[PDB]
């Protein structure tokens, strides 16, 4: 109902997620998303684009 | 006053042999001179060669750009002295009025 939040925080949260992912991607690569997916507890696909997005 | 005296690269190579020449002998010298410690003292640094690594590529990679100036090195030549005689001779070979 609050577009601000509705706008800002969502994306804001999403960054945090990345920031988390970013922190999770600190563990080095060639690593299965599902790890992180599992780690973050998110769909790899759901991860992916966002993951990709970065 | 020094300056008043005297009056590129191949040299740099030239010593290449020199030490090596003696060196191996210098062993064989001391070898068969005494046939000291310092020789082994040398011996270690020896492997300091065949040392080269695909870091070699860097060289290659580096050497590339080095050459990029090529088309530029003589480009100005390419452009510079060629179109220089065409403005002095046309002026001149045709100067030739009376």
């Amino acid at each position: 109902g609050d577009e601000l939040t509705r706008s800002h925080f969502n994306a804001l949260y999403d960054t945090l997620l990345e920031s988390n992912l970013c922190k999770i991607i600190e563990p080095f690569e060639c690593v299965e998303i599902s790890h992180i997916s599992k780690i973050i507890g998110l769909d790899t696909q759901q991860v992916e684009g966002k993951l990709s997005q970065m | 006053g020094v300056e008043h005296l005297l009056r590129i690269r191949l040299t740099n190579q030239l010593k290449s042999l020199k030490g090596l020449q003696s060196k191996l002998k210098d062993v064989v010298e001391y070898l068969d001179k005494v046939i000291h410690t310092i020789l082994g003292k040398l011996q270690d640094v020896f492997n300091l060669n065949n040392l080269q690594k695909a870091l070699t590529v860097k060289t290659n990679d580096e050497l590339m750009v080095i050459y990029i100036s090529n088309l530029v090195r003589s480009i100005i030549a390419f452009d510079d002295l060629i179109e220089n005689k065409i403005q002095n001779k046309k002026i001149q070979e045709q100067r030739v009025k009376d």
Binding site: S52 | M64, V65, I68, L71, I75, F78, D79
Partner: protein
């Protein structure tokens, strides 16, 4: 002129709907009543002629024509000739009185401009120019030169013509670099962003076309949605993620006209929907955009497939850049499309090579390629000098 030339274009494009036909000449059929449009509406009725433009009271009346609105009457002409002559006769002695009294400098050129603008209404690509010339002959103002811009713009863009006008557009803007101070650069870049939009603009004035707005539009030469639409799509289909997601990500400009015209719904809309990195959603959005955008508008149609497959390709870059390792299957299969057919035109991007995509048919898997030291940087180097070297060979090819 604008709707004229477009409702020209529209029906001259009539493919999808009889309305594409209908709606267009509908007005025109009244607009030829509005203005005495015959002399080009004459050839305009030969414009779409030999397709469906084949039904006319003067030129051709044919059943294969789905448009009969490409019809005339000589009354139109009599009306016209009257109107015209009326117009003519009016300005004649008027301009002649402008000549007689030595009356005004631009005020002389004024009724000239009036003389000219008839030909805009008339669909005469003639005296108006000479009139403009003899307007411009009377032009003491770059504002009359501005009117040259207008004129030449009304000239070419009444037919949506090309170069001379653009050239004039240059020539007219070449005189004083002012650009109507802030503006006529607009008209310049506008029409330029249309000129170059023939058929291209592609990178070129697409930006420019995107850039200034709405700082003019023209009526008879354009509407504002027009540039917006046009500016968007090309600049869109051309420019960067960043740029677009810097700019068409949105503009108050956009925010104003977003879906205001629905005359878009798609352009970056479905493209940022694409730029959301979709697969399937955008896959219709294309043609959804296309037939709603491309076929509709002059250059938007005329260019056609420039657009089509690049964004098609484009996303794959994203899709690649996501994945070193992407299963094309996971792509083409798991994207719920023709694998192969998708893959085929996708494979038609192997020779277009803009794929770094390293891609399977069998295992249906996609991989990447990368500039590395090669780049184009240490890559392009070869030819660049070569061409010079040629010119350098050419250089020495002089000697004597």
């Amino acid at each position: 002129n604008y709707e004229v030339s477009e409702k020209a274009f529209l029906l001259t494009q009539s493919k999808v709907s009889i309305e594409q036909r209908k709606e267009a000449a509908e007005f025109v059929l009244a607009k030829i009543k509005e203005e005495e449009m015959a002399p080009y509406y004459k050839y305009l009725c030969e414009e779409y002629l030999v397709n469906n433009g084949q039904s006319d009271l003067e030129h051709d009346e044919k059943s294969d024509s789905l448009n009969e609105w490409i019809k005339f009457d000589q009354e139109l002409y009599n009306e016209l000739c009257k109107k015209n002559e009326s117009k003519i006769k009016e300005l004649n002695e008027k301009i002649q009185k402008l000549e007689e009294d030595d009356e005004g400098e631009l005020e002389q050129a004024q009724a000239w401009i009036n003389l000219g603008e008839y030909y805009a209404q008339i669909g005469d690509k003639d005296n108006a120019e000479k009139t403009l010339g003899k307007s411009l002959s009377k032009a003491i103002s770059t504002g009359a030169k501005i009117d040259v811009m207008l004129t030449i713009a009304r000239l070419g863009f009444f037919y949506n013509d090309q170069l001379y006008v653009k050239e004039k557009l240059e020539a007219v803007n070449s005189m004083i670099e002012k650009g109507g101070d802030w503006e006529r650069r607009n008209r310049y870049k506008t029409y330029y962003g249309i000129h170059c939009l023939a058929v291209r603009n592609f990178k070129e004035a697409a930006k420019l076309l995107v850039d200034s707005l709405a700082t003019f539009t023209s009526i008879e030469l354009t509407s504002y949605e027009s540039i917006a639409t046009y500016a968007s799509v090309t600049g869109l289909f051309t420019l960067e993620r960043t740029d677009l997601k810097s700019k068409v990500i949105d503009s108050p400009e956009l925010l104003s006209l977003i879906s205001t015209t629905a005359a878009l719904q798609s352009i970056s809309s479905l493209t940022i929907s694409l730029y959301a990195s979709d697969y399937a959603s955008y896959f219709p959005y294309l043609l959804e955009t296309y037939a709603n955008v491309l076929i509709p508008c002059k250059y938007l149609n005329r260019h056609a497939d420039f657009f089509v497959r690049e964004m098609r390709r484009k996303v794959y870059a994203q899709l690649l850049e996501s994945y070193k390792t992407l299963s094309l299957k996971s792509m083409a299969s798991a994207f719920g499309v023709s694998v192969a057919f998708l893959d085929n035109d996708l494979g038609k991007f192997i020779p277009n090579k803009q794929l770094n995509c390293v891609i399977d048919r069998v295992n249906g898997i996609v991989e990447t390629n990368r500039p590395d030291n090669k780049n184009a940087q240490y890559h392009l180097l070869v030819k660049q000098g070569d061409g010079l070297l040629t010119k350098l060979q050419k250089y020495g090819a002089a000697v004597r």
